Amino acid sequence: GSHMEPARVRCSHLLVKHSQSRRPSSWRQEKITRTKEEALELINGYIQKIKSGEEDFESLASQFSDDSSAKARGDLGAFSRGQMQKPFEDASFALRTGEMSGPVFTDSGIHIILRTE
Structure with a gap:
């Protein structure tokens, strides 16, 4: 039936990090030169x-x-x-x-969330 707002949800998550983060070093760039606006x-x-x-x-x-x-x-x-x-x-x-x-x-950056379920 129509059952929204559950305890377990499934979604995919993309993340783009920026200089001001827990670590300005990603796997794409050793030193993240892009800020939030850029990201x-x-x-x-x-x-x-x-x-x-x-x-x-x-x-x-x-x-x-x-x-x-x-x-x-x-x-x-x-x-x-x-x-x-x-x-x-x-x-x-x-x-x-x-x-x-x-x-x-x-905190880490900007996340893109898609509802897989």
């Missing part, structure tokens, strides 16, 4: 490419995600809200089936 453009670029049916989320999340989850397709499983960040939570739980939250600002 935001990358974010929009990926989002546009994905939703337009040009690129895939898992595709871009594996190459253009500065997170370790990148090599794991960037797709997550069914997790609980207490296992993620509050901004990440609000986004993932507010998304409908096959919906994308867009640029979710966090």
Whole structure:
């Protein structure tokens, strides 16, 4: 039936990091020269490419995600809200089936969340 707002949700997560972060060193750049504003453009670029049916989320999340989850397709499983960040939570739980939250600002950087489930 129609059961939204659960305990376990599944979504994919892309992450673009910026100079002001827990570490200004990604796997794409040894010294992240891009700030939040700059990273935001990358974010929009990926989002546009994905939703337009040009690129895939898992595709871009594996190459253009500065997170370790990148090599794991960037797709997550069914997790609980207490296992993620509050901004990440609000986004993932507010998304409908096959919906994308867009640029979710966090401490590490900007996350792109797509509702896999």
